[PDB]
Amino acid sequence: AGARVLQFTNCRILRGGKLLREDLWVRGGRILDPEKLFFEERRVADERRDCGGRILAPGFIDVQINGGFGVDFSQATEDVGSGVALVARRILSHGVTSFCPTLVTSPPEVYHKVVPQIPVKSGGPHGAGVLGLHLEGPFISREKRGAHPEAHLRSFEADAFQDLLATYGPLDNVRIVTLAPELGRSHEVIRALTARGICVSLGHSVADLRAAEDAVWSGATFITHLFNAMLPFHHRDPGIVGLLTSDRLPAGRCIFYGMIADGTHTNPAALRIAHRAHPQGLVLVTDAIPALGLGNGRHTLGQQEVEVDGLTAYVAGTKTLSGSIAPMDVCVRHFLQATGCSMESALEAASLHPAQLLGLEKSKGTLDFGADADFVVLDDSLHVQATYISGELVWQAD
Amino acid sequence: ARVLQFTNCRILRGGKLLREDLWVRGGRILDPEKLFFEERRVADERRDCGGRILAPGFIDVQINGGFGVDFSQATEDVGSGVALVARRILSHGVTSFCPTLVTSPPEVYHKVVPQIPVKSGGPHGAGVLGLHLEGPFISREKRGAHPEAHLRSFEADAFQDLLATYGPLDNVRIVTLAPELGRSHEVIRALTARGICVSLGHSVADLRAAEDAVWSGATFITHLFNAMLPFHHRDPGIVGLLTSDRLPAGRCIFYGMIADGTHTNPAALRIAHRAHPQGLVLVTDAIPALGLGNGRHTLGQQEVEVDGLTAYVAGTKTLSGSIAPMDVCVRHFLQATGCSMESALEAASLHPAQLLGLEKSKGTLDFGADADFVVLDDSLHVQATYISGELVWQADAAR
Ligand SMILES: [Zn+2]
Ligand SMILES: [Zn+2]
């Protein structure tokens, strides 16, 4: 009640699935109902900001990003925190206001050192907020390891959740774990992780549909880059993609799924068929690697060497895709162009949906009253012109 | 000239089940308001439907035979076999169909095609809308149950090669071919210029090849997912037509699906219906073993064995068509997709009518259309079948 009231005017705002010609009101970092404010507090805006007719949408949330701008999160470097901060800062210019630093399959000693150095952290002028870690691997399949090194894959059979605890170390900073559910004893691990509030995602897996459905019933709620590093859809063997159409899942519970809309990992047909089959679950992720923002050269991805050739990142010396160099705003615009969906659907896939996945939909991913005032200013092509966190301008184009 | 009024019914009209009466006169659906312009404003007969559903009669555009009849055999009485099938499928809710012939030697087409002409429906059976010729101009890689020995190609003289194979095409309504065949573009233009629907099937065509064939005039896909490349995130193949933005504006690509519970799992029916609901066409793809069950049968030049309710080419695990009737397919599609009753009924009637340009006379309960319709309960069991406003089959007479 003791903070300044900001009124953003001459804008279209994404609210309730629609672009509305309505002002955005903010105080103390949260969005205000202006009618409630005048009718209970009898207060008007302390400051007005003309948005020039542009679009305001909730800031993007990237739940799978391995690094960027030369930073590799899967390295136990001397200043891990500095690298996270650099990425957090730079992705503001991509419209990203929250993200999950992601680590790929690594030896346990890397997790033991890196994980405690990347805790949850609120966004601000210092960069997008850190929502917690996404640990992708090592409990994934050899057949679909993709860019993950075979030598550091692990399994559960010995002592299940304790094997995972010994591998990663304390899980306080962890928010998502990608695993392959066909691993023996995955049920016990999925129960333990979700009981601790950790989202379980299915990926890098040769699981069939029934195994995937079992994993959802155990508590899994996410699919890691749909179509990538999993078996294809077959009309008598649907695999993980079949989760998008399954009627055997808990009634009314939304299974979410990431898609990499960089133009290389999935064709327009795949983005369209998923968006049409299950629009509410689609989550845009960058799956970015350290070459994000650099565009070329040799980089690392954990224990692997990565080479960027043209606009595509491969494990050095191979034709194995190893992440993306497309920032989130590029993914949003590509998803929009490739699917022919509405601007609202593209913006929701990059913010609302990841927020819902993580249970944050009351504070992030929306412009609803009471939510955090994390939003981006967009032109009609969905180019980012400005980024706000807690109602404060934290990045502006030039 | 009698006016029939069906009362106490829900009718499928405009994509909705409406509690409205159905009026019929002269074999056609009647606008009751037209009676205000005539001398008599009351029906000559009223039929209380007990709250049941009236829907357009099913249209099966891919059925190879059934009940011991194999359309792809040059027997001494081809017409009698077609009539037998036509008669029996009334009990499955089917009031029109396209007898389908599989890959055969040219001598079979020359004898059989002239003996299966278009024929209106009636008490003697479902109407014949024309022939569906599936093959022989299809891929070796995806020939399925079609015999390798009788596949053919176009490269020599294209449409003339097709004419020499089939003989005169007057009775032909659909041709399934693989568009990656050389000179397929020419054949597709020639067929569609003559009013023949071209369907893509038994093909390893990539998406671009499939889209090109649509631009050439193709409007149908033969049993989606069966005998074609899978949906894939690098190149979706023919299935990608359901999501393509590269097709002629305003053209609905239609696609058949076999909803027998064996040819495609529920995920496939769901993913297609959600990606492109307006194009989905239910076909039985029935084979001569329909209604006979286990044992040895034929499918054209092939021997077929039905073992455990599944049809295979004898001595193989190669699927060779279906033994599920259309009403079973309708109910399976409904249950498997969770779609509306209206969507399931439209996929079995409206959509195949639209494919064939017949939506003003078949596949609808619109005014002026042919009064071909079925009486259904809420589980979509067919309890009665009407053609030209006349009752031609009834499940029982308990009511
Ligand atoms: Zn991955
Ligand atoms: Zn076929």
Curated annotation (Swiss-Prot), chain A:
Reaction it catalyzes: N-acetyl-D-glucosamine 6-phosphate + H2O = D-glucosamine 6-phosphate + acetate
One biological process term in Gene Ontology: N-acetylglucosamine catabolic process
Superkingdom, natural source: Eukaryota
Enzyme Commission no: 3.5.1.25
GO molecular function: metal ion binding; N-acetylglucosamine-6-phosphate deacetylase activity
Cofactor note: Binds 1 divalent metal cation per subunit.
Chain positions recorded as a divalent metal cation binding sites: E136, H204, H225
Binding-site residues for substrate, renumbered to this chain: A147, H148, N228, A229, R236, D262, G263, T264, H265, L321, S322, G323
A GO term from the CC aspect: cytosol
Class in the EC hierarchy, top level: hydrolase
Residues annotated as the enzyme's active site: D287
Keyword Hydrolase: yes
Record's keyword terms, sorted: Carbohydrate metabolism, Hydrolase, Metal-binding
Xref: CDD domains: NagA
Pathway involvement of the protein, from the record: Amino-sugar metabolism; N-acetylneuraminate degradation
PANTHER family recorded: N-ACETYLGLUCOSAMINE-6-PHOSPHATE DEACETYLASE
Function: Hydrolyzes the N-glycolyl group from N-glycolylglucosamine 6-phosphate (GlcNGc-6-P) in the N-glycolylneuraminic acid (Neu5Gc) degradation pathway. Although human is not able to catalyze formation of Neu5Gc due to the inactive CMAHP enzyme, Neu5Gc is present in food and must be degraded.
Family listed: Belongs to the metallo-dependent hydrolases superfamily. NagA family.
Protein name: N-acetylglucosamine-6-phosphate deacetylase
Organism: Homo sapiens
Taxon lineage: Eukaryota, Metazoa, Chordata, Craniata, Vertebrata
UniProtKB/Swiss-Prot annotation, chain B:
Protein name (Swiss-Prot/TrEMBL): N-acetylglucosamine-6-phosphate deacetylase
Pfam family, one: Amidohydro_1
NCBIfam families: nagA
EC number, as in UniProt: 3.5.1.25
Binding site for substrate: A145, H146, N226, A227, R234, D260, G261, T262, H263, L319, S320, G321
One function term, GO molecular function aspect: N-acetylglucosamine-6-phosphate deacetylase activity
Record-level GO cellular component terms: cytosol; nucleus
Similarity annotation: Belongs to the metallo-dependent hydrolases superfamily. NagA family.
Domain of life: Eukaryota
Catalytic activity reported: N-acetyl-D-glucosamine 6-phosphate + H2O = D-glucosamine 6-phosphate + acetate
Encoding gene per record: AMDHD2
Cofactor mode of binding and number, as noted: Binds 1 divalent metal cation per subunit.
Coiled coil: none
Enzyme class, first EC level, given as a word: hydrolase
InterPro entries per the UniProt record, alphabetical: Amidohydro-rel, GlcNAc_6-P_deAcase, Metal-dep_hydrolase_composite, Metal_Hydrolase
Cofactor: a divalent metal cation
CDD domains: NagA (cd00854)
Protein purpose: Hydrolyzes the N-glycolyl group from N-glycolylglucosamine 6-phosphate (GlcNGc-6-P) in the N-glycolylneuraminic acid (Neu5Gc) degradation pathway. Although human is not able to catalyze formation of Neu5Gc due to the inactive CMAHP enzyme, Neu5Gc is present in food and must be degraded.
BP terms from Gene Ontology: N-acetylglucosamine catabolic process; N-acetylneuraminate catabolic process; negative regulation of UDP-N-acetylglucosamine biosynthetic process; UDP-N-acetylglucosamine biosynthetic process
Chain sites annotated for binding a divalent metal cation: E134, H202, H223
Transmembrane segments: none
Keywords annotated in UniProt: Carbohydrate metabolism, Hydrolase, Metal-binding
